[PDB]
Amino acid sequence: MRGSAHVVILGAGTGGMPAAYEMKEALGSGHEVTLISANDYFQFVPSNPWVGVGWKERDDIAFPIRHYVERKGIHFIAQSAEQIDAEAQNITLADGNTVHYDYLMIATGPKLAFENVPGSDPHEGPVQSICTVDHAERAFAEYQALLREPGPIVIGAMAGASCFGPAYEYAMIVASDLKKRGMRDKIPSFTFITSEPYIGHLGIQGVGDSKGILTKGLKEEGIEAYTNCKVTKVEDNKMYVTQVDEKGETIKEMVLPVKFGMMIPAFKGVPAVAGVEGLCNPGGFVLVDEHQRSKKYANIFAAGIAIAIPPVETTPVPTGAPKTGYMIESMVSAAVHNIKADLEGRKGEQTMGTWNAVCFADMGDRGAAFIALPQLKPRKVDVFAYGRWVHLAKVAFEKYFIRKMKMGVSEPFYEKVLFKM
Amino acid sequence: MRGSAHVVILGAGTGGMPAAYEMKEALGSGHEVTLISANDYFQFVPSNPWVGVGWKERDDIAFPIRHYVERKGIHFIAQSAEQIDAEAQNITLADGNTVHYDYLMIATGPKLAFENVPGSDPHEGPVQSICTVDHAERAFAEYQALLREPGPIVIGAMAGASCFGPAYEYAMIVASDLKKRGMRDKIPSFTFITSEPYIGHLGIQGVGDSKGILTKGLKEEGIEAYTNCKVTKVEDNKMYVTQVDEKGETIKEMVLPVKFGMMIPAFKGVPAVAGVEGLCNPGGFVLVDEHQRSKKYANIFAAGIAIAIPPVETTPVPTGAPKTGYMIESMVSAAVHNIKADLEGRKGEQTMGTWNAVCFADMGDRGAAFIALPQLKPRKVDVFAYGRWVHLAKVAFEKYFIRKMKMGVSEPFYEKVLFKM
Numbered sequence A, B: 001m002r003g004s005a006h007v008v009i010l011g012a013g014t015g016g017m018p019a020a021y022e023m024k025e026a027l028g029s030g031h032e033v034t035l036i037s038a039n040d041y042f043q044f045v046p047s048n049p050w051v052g053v054g055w056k057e058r059d060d061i062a063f064p065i066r067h068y069v070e071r072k073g074i075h076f077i078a079q080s081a082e083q084i085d086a087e088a089q090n091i092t093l094a095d096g097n098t099v100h101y102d103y104l105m106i107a108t109g110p111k112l113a114f115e116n117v118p119g120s121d122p123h124e125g126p127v128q129s130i131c132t133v134d135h136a137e138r139a140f141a142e143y144q145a146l147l148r149e150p151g152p153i154v155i156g157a158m159a160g161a162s163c164f165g166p167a168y169e170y171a172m173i174v175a176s177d178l179k180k181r182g183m184r185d186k187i188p189s190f191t192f193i194t195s196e197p198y199i200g201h202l203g204i205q206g207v208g209d210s211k212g213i214l215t216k217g218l219k220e221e222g223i224e225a226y227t228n229c230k231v232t233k234v235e236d237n238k239m240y241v242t243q244v245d246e247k248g249e250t251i252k253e254m255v256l257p258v259k260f261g262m263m264i265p266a267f268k269g270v271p272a273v274a275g276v277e278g279l280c281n282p283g284g285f286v287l288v289d290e291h292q293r294s295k296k297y298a299n300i301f302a303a304g305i306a307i308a309i310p311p312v313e314t315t316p317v318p319t320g321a322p323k324t325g326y327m328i329e330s331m332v333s334a335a336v337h338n339i340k341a342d343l344e345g346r347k348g349e350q351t352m353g354t355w356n357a358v359c360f361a362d363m364g365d366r367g368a369a370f371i372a373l374p375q376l377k378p379r380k381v382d383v384f385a386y387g388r389w390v391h392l393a394k395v396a397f398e399k400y401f402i403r404k405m406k407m408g409v410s411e412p413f414y415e416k417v418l419f420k421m
């Protein structure tokens, strides 16, 4: 309303949950902050591969949201948005109720585009997913069925994927868990299929010696690896794979039987968002300026995987660059600042800062991690690390981030760099 | 004087130069800041290996100090301190004049202890040094004489050394320069001798895969490498080397002829400082608290290589852990803050923060670098990197640091982390 704006945050995920707390903190009791999300629970996404192999339980990485945001003065609606009318500024929910907003911050993350590859939906066949806790639990279940009746395994990333790390993580921990159970030698074949032009490209043209280390890692585990691949369909428990050359011409086709599989799908924008006329690129990603503000609607901001980021490269098989946690938090922070400035006469000048990618993977006793910035080479920082300490660090962050989501955020998150003083 | 303290900074090096500017900045026109140093010029120490092989010139990495500090209100005395009387608070200079101080900040760096190994002084034989620009120029001269009359090369680090990176850097760029000149095959033998218990220990129990990468690096260049070594003497153009086992027992002795050599010496405290009764440990390093204040004299602070840091390990051949730039700058910053607090009633609470080590080495087209913290494993950060970008980064820092030394320091130096916004 006039003088008491209603700010709606769409999606309670890695960007959206912190955004709710930071928004309420920044605005105070004079304005209304409402968080709207498809699920009634928060989940720590980087832990999903471990759930998918059974090293973690849902209850470890997920919790109900309502009480934690409400104790902070934030309204929570556990309902999916089905339609957004940007002209009238009304959101229509699954149940048919509509919610008016003065500002909308979209943090809806990715739509998992299984439709790109007929038969690839985890409910349609043997190729599973570890992108969500619902999918990871399902993947483990299928993993157990593999144990009962051993057969070929196929893990990897689809054409158009942007999130490659989890594919490698999952393959390594599956190989490890097989050994730990003494079942590894019952597997007919273990294949790694990726849309990357080479092993360890990671959608970022490689980082440190990611290529040499991931290549040798897969070999060590007796995992056969193919690059420049796209899966055309999954059918009759078989994966149909087409491999191209640098010029995108077929150098071979393969038909791989799968008893158990997991392929990272391409990400698109969610339908309710993609469906807003003139808001998104053809992929369904919100077109924003450096201040995180929609280029079409002044009262619409966006953050996280939901936003569009121009490609810097064009690979033989389409691939994308990942949008990761540190950059997402900078996006959120910028959006909150600029919305507040809008509510106070100023035009917020805050930006996301320099593009970067940061990823951690835990293999059990030790981990791998990388930092790359900015996007194009030669970089200012281009590092890949492996060791027991990386494992200890992922463990620590998960427990920290989760506690933070229950307690509140009133400061710049990554003051985590207090381990210097 | 009363109400207008005289603050003396001893040593215009990596810690001492910034300390002068930061001290004057912090204190203002009400107090007197005097910088006293053995040489009339500043030198960028990490560039010395390159001078030693002729890839850089003195004029590139060194400049006269007087004008730059004086334009800032700082007094400069280009004279070595020979005696410090801590009771009377008088410094006696080489010329015999004495300077009274109310506060003394010691930043005198290392004494290069060539005396530990008879015949090792660069002026006494074939084993040279790249620790100072005077020594690096001399080393290059000897390098040219090697070119005219090829013979065995020996590079490495002595017992008690704490600065291992430069040894590896120097060996690699010597090997490279030999190739570039087409002289590499005229060398009878190229040996690497170190006091480290293994290749890439670096005085820090290794960092990332420093071991595997430095080992393979030396092999690639046909450099034969021996660890757990100490040099007992240099004599008749021969290096007498004793190699021990884990229990410090001799497993072999070697006599190596040297036409051209470079060994990093052990560091001790400088005589004028070590000579202050009750100030130093037996090595000549100033015993300080967490606030950088002498444990014996309240008006004496210290920073940089000059301070004592307890060992965390005890290797078969004595070795030390390096004191590097980021930590040194934190020491300086802490000292300046706490002296100012002293001049204003408060007890300064500022500390150096977490122990860390950071080193960059440039091989020509690409570089190697590491970050380790804290001192003991498992660490919070333990990373080793290599690439063209590391080279570009060392180049950039040298030019930045040098400009900063000419222009002044009024802020926390490493706001260099502005490459994020």
Ligand SMILES: Cc1cc2nc3c(=O)[nH]c(=O)nc-3n(C[C@H](O)[C@H](O)[C@H](O)COP(=O)(O)OP(=O)(O)OC[C@H]3O[C@@H](n4cnc5c(N)ncnc54)[C@H](O)[C@@H]3O)c2cc1C
Binding pocket: A010, A011, A012, A013, A014, A015, A016, A036, A037, A038, A039, A045, A046, A047, A048, A049, A079, A080, A081, A082, A107, A108, A109, A110, A130, A131, A132, A163, A166, A270, A272, A273, A303, A304, A305, A306, A323, A324, A325, A326, A328, A358, A359, A360, A361
């Ligand atoms: C398996 C995996 C591992 C990863 N590991 C790392 C890592 O180690 N480090 C790192 O920095 N990044 C990692 N990422 C990348 C990244 O950070 C995450 O994907 C992160 O959760 C994305 O943040 P987000 O807020 O943009 O999307 P999300 O976290 O997916 O949140 C989006 C949310 O909005 C909701 N939603 C969607 N549509 C609607 C609708 N119509 N109405 C209401 N709500 C809706 C969702 O249900 C959800 O809560 C990983 C990603 C995956 C898939």
Ligand SMILES: Cc1cc2nc3c(=O)[nH]c(=O)nc-3n(C[C@H](O)[C@H](O)[C@H](O)COP(=O)(O)OP(=O)(O)OC[C@H]3O[C@@H](n4cnc5c(N)ncnc54)[C@H](O)[C@@H]3O)c2cc1C
Binding pocket: B010, B011, B012, B013, B014, B015, B016, B036, B037, B038, B039, B045, B046, B047, B048, B049, B079, B080, B081, B082, B107, B108, B109, B110, B130, B131, B132, B163, B166, B270, B272, B273, B303, B304, B305, B306, B323, B324, B325, B326, B328, B358, B359, B360, B361
């Ligand atoms: C070859 C080499 C390469 C290195 N590379 C790196 C690197 O890449 N990164 C990193 O973080 N560190 C590096 N270091 C380690 C370190 O940072 C440096 O040694 C640094 O210069 C030390 O700072 P300092 O102020 O303690 O000593 P110094 O820089 O040596 O300054 C000490 C000073 O005080 C003076 N002095 C000594 N005695 C007296 C006296 N009696 N009276 C008056 N003045 C006196 C000196 O002449 C000198 O100016 C390197 C060191 C060496 C030797």
Ligand SMILES: CCCCCCCCCCCCO[C@@H]1O[C@H](CO)[C@@H](O[C@H]2O[C@H](CO)[C@@H](O)[C@H](O)[C@H]2O)[C@H](O)[C@H]1O
Binding pocket: A165, A166, A168, A169, A172, A213, A214, A216, A217, A218, A359, A360, A361, A363, A368, A369, A370, A385, A386, A387, B208, B209, B212
């Ligand atoms: C999170 C980013 C995305 C990546 C996710 C996928 C992770 C895949 C894991 C592959 C690693 C397996 O291979 C592993 O590589 C490391 C690094 O060279 C080796 O480890 C080597 O370097 C490390 C430090 O970096 C040393 O501590 C070690 O002593 C040395 O042998 C291991 O000997 C090898 O077992």
Ligand SMILES: CCCCCCCCCCCCO[C@@H]1O[C@H](CO)[C@@H](O[C@H]2O[C@H](CO)[C@@H](O)[C@H](O)[C@H]2O)[C@H](O)[C@H]1O
Binding pocket: A208, A209, A212, B165, B166, B168, B169, B172, B213, B214, B216, B217, B218, B359, B360, B361, B363, B368, B369, B370, B385, B386, B387
């Ligand atoms: C500054 C810290 C102290 C150390 C100073 C001494 C430096 C010594 C240099 C030795 C490096 C030589 O060996 C070199 O190692 C790197 C890293 O594995 C290899 O490079 C490998 O990893 C890098 C990234 O990390 C990739 O860009 C590269 O494609 C890959 O091959 C090179 O193929 C090899 O030539």
Ligand SMILES: CCCCCCCCCCC1=C(C)C(=O)C(OC)=C(OC)C1=O
Binding pocket: A046, A324, A325, A326, A356, A357, A358, A359, A360, A371, A373, A393, A394, A395, A397, A398, A416
């Ligand atoms: C962009 C410049 C470097 C950023 C600093 C990275 C280190 C601080 C925490 C990083 C981090 C960790 C440890 C981590 O485990 C993790 O996985 C959940 C991340 O993703 C959100 C992280 O961003």
Ligand SMILES: CCCCCCCCCCC1=C(C)C(=O)C(OC)=C(OC)C1=O
Binding pocket: B046, B324, B325, B326, B356, B357, B358, B359, B360, B371, B373, B393, B394, B395, B397, B398, B416
């Ligand atoms: C302790 C935690 C990490 C510190 C941040 C390191 C990166 C910023 C500059 C580092 C640096 C560079 C690049 C460098 O080239 C260099 O050599 C002269 C150093 O020594 C003084 C450095 O400290």
Ligand SMILES: [S]
Binding pocket: A163, A164, A165, A166, A202, A322, A359
């Ligand atoms: S990734």
Ligand SMILES: [S]
Binding pocket: B163, B164, B165, B166, B202, B322, B359
């Ligand atoms: S070093």
